[PDB]
């Protein structure tokens, strides 16, 4: 499978010029992203009262 498609740094060997498609986002765990102190600190307090 690596000689056919191959990692993102080593091209495909059996095909002429093919590298695995790149990723539009790496850490796809937006739960871990969202409850992270980096982002958690930069938020206003939730306005969770119903009027």
């Amino acid at each position: 499978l690596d000689d056919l498609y191959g990692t993102w740094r080593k091209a495909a060997s059996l095909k002429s010029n093919y590298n695995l498609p790149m990723h539009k986002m790496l850490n796809t765990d937006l739960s871990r992203i969202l409850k992270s102190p980096e982002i958690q600190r930069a938020l206003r307090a939730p306005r969770k009262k119903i009027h």
């Binding site: 796809t28 765990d29 937006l30 739960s31």
Partner: protein, 124 residues
Amino acid sequence: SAHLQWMVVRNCSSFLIKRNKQTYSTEPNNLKARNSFRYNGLIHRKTVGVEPAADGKGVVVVMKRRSGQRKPATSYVRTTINKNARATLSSIRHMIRKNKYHPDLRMAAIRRASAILRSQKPVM
């Protein structure tokens, strides 16, 4: 990842069932059986299931261990609780709280382990 394969499973699953303006789900370890990210029993890294015991009495609890994630055979652990209606509903509660294991599912697990006891008492 969880949100990825939920954005893949939200509409083109095989357990998804859509009729009569309702949309439930038949996943193995989905409790409340309804199609949602929170209660889906296959997407997350740690799930909880509460099935009826294979014999007449008891309730089996199926936790999904963390270490084995791509090994379906050695992924789930199962514990049969054949006790009274209250000790089992304090054992599931401890299993979830004291372990801090997917804690937003606890009241769902109690309500299900009560539905099983109720569907395993002698009928009238």
